[PDB]
Ligand binder design. Structure first.
Ligand SMILES: CCCCCCCC/C=C\CCCCCCCC(=O)N[C@@H](CO[C@@H]1O[C@H](CO)[C@H](O)[C@H](O)[C@H]1O)[C@H](O)/C=C/CCCCCCCCCCCCC
Length: 211
């Protein structure tokens, strides 16, 4: 096994509910799962990333826990905010999920480069950044990304952070397992992100604001 098939981690183990509903807890658990990897790779240097993710998961969860029966899916949360005219209120779940999906599109891009055989982690990150998050960042935040990029792990340190037992990365079985697991993880994520993108587009929730 690899990190990408560990319990609660994979987007591929999330089954959709009626009307393509994305279950709230399972989705948020998949988002959280990368946090310990960030901590293995750079507890200080990637702290902005960790804080962003944790904060957005918190903001979605804060609405969820208010009425779990009502808020069984992401769509139910967003659509309630829209009905209540609170999607634009500070700390909304709609805003938190906007930034979660943006961050996941970046993660998907980066892991696709890796899956397709990119061994330069900086190249992989920077290629994915340009296509995803860069458009949403201003000058100062682009500078923070550039700082993070300089501190990118070696390929070996990166894959070592994705093993279930130390040393696994030196086995061919692991490379095969990475391919197996990413070949499920990535299209499952894509499917969910497409659902979310449609939801945001249709309801006029894709904000043009940059940070
Ligand atoms: C599988 C194991 C792989 C390990 C993970 C490595 C890749 C990490 C990839 C994705 C994780 C998610 C990235 C987080 C992107 C931050 C989202 C972002 O642009 N959030 C914005 C806006 O913030 C919003 O502000 C709003 C108000 O204006 C609200 O307050 C919202 O709540 C709030 O979110 C925030 O200003 C920026 C935060 C951090 C940007 C730092 C540069 C990112 C470095 C990239 C990762 C490096 C990879 C590590 C090495 C492999």
């Amino acid at each position: 096994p690899t990190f990408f098939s560990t319990m609660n981690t994979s987007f591929s183990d999330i089954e959709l509910l009626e009307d393509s509903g994305i279950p709230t807890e399972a989705f948020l658990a998949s988002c959280y799962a990368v946090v310990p990897v960030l901590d293995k790779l750079g507890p200080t240097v990637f702290a902005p990333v960790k804080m962003d993710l944790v904060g957005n998961i918190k903001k979605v969860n804060q609405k969820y826990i208010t009425n779990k029966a009502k808020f069984t899916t992401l769509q139910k949360i967003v659509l309630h905010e829209v009905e209540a005219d609170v999607a634009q209120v500070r700390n909304s779940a709609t805003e938190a999920l906007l930034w979660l999906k943006r961050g996941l599109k970046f993660l998907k891009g980066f892991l696709t480069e890796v899956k397709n055989g990119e061994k330069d982690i900086q190249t992989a990150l920077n290629n994915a950044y340009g296509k995803t998050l860069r458009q949403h960042h201003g000058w100062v935040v682009r500078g923070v990304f550039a700082l993070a990029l300089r501190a990118a792990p070696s390929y070996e340190d990166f894959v070592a952070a994705l093993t279930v037992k130390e040393g696994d990365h030196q086995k061919e079985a692991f490379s095969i397992g990475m391919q197996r697991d990413l070949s499920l993880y990535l299209p499952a994520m894509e499917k969910q992100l497409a659902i979310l993108d449609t939801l945001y587009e249709v309801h006029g929730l894709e904000s043009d604001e940059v940070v």
